[PDB]
Amino acid sequence: SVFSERTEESSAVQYFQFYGYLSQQQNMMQDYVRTGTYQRAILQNHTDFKDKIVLDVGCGSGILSFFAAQAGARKIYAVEASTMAQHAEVLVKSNNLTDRIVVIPGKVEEVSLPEQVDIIISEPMGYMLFNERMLESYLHAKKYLKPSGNMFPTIGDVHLAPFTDEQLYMEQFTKANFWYQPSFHGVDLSALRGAAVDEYFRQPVVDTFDIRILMAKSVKYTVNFLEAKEGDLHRIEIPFKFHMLHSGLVHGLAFWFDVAFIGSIMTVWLSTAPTEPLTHWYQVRCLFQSPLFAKAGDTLSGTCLLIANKRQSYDISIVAQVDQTGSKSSNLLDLKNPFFRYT
């Protein structure tokens, strides 16, 4: 299967074991912004669902499928690969919807659907949108979508912006400098200080922040789920040219994302921006190894390259330079092992 080919089995096992827990499903369900916005997007665009055939990619508890049912869908195929699939089946029965919702256990890349569908619904977004690589399953599912069929969400925007946060930056060295002591219980640890610094900076930082740390208007990279192919997500190149609104040291790039449900009646947005109420996605920050000084009016140019790996995540390569000075910075990050800083 397309899934097995791009995924190490260990990662897959861990991944689907994770979503097999009712507590995790609960965690997602209790994100009111997320769940409420999905429900609103579906119900307020009822003409896109009334008497239509729906596919729910990775249904988990089945919540989105129930929303599709509330909107008057004729038939909903709810595909789920973790053991949660059996819990979803229990809920379909207890909610007396066996005639409209059909739970299909397995990976969307591997199962068979009896018919083509009018619309695909899913919640495949991870940290900085792409983590977990579930968007590829979402796009893969379009083999079951009728021509002129729709996708909910329809588009996803990843936003990047430079930030300044001296304390976050210094924190890394504060932690790494544990190893910079010549006699920890008689042992000289200093030779590993460099490796410890490297390790900490390889971790994207998951948490939220004050919008005032942002130093320029965000650059946006858009994925149109109606048009995109799975292969499009294997290598994501995000060029950027920031026009600095404030002077100071740029310690790295902040990441967040929006998705839009573009229905026949209206477009509904779900945003994880730092200007919006917090979600379980928080925001993500990737530090530069060396901060870059910029003046208001300077331009900070470069590239963020996301390379998919078989651990259902991305290797992140960020290169940035201040055009006016030529001062340059690079970093390589492992999105699979983020540092959850939020407290």
Ligand X SMILES: Nc1ncnc2c1ncn2[C@@H]1O[C@H](C[N+]2(CC[C@H](N)C(=O)O)CC2)[C@@H](O)[C@H]1O
Is 280 a known active-site residue? yes
The residue type of 245 is: L
Residue written as token pair 């827990």: 21
Residue written as token pair 């080919």: 5
The residue type of 1 is: S
For the CB of residue 166, give the shortest distance to a second copy in the complex, in Å. 8
- Residue 98 binds a second copy (CB under 8 A): no
Which distant-in-sequence residues (6+ apart) come within 8 Å of 10 by Cβ? none
Q: For 86-123, b where at least 16 C-beta lie within 10 A, e where not — what string? A: ebbbebbeeeebeebbbbbbebbbeeebeeebbbbbbb
66 binds, among a second copy, ligand X, none (CB under 5 to 8 A by kind): a second copy
26 binds, among a second copy, ligand X, none (CB under 5 to 8 A by kind): a second copy
**Out of 112, 148, 183, 275, the residue judged to bind a second copy by CB under 8 A:** 183
Nearer to ligand X, 89 or 165 (CB): 89
- Residue 192 binds a second copy (CB under 8 A): yes
Nearer to ligand X, 28 or 238 (CB): 28
Tell me the sheet residues that pair with 323: none
Residue written as token pair 């499928």: 65
Is 123 a known active-site residue? yes
Residues 14-33 that bind a second copy (CB under 8 A): 14, 21-23, 26, 29-30, 32
Tell me the sheet residues that pair with 224: 155
- Residue 200 binds a second copy (CB under 8 A): yes
Nearer to ligand X, 169 or 179 (CB): 179
Residue 279 corresponds to which tokens in the numbers above? 């979600």
Residue 285 labelled as part of a binding site: no
Residue 327's CB is within 10 A of a number of other CB atoms, namely 16
Binding site for ligand X (CB under 6 A): 3, 16, 19, 28-29, 58-61, 63-64, 79-82, 84, 107-109, 123, 134, 137
What residue numbers does the annotated binding site cover?
25, 34, 58, 80, 109, 137
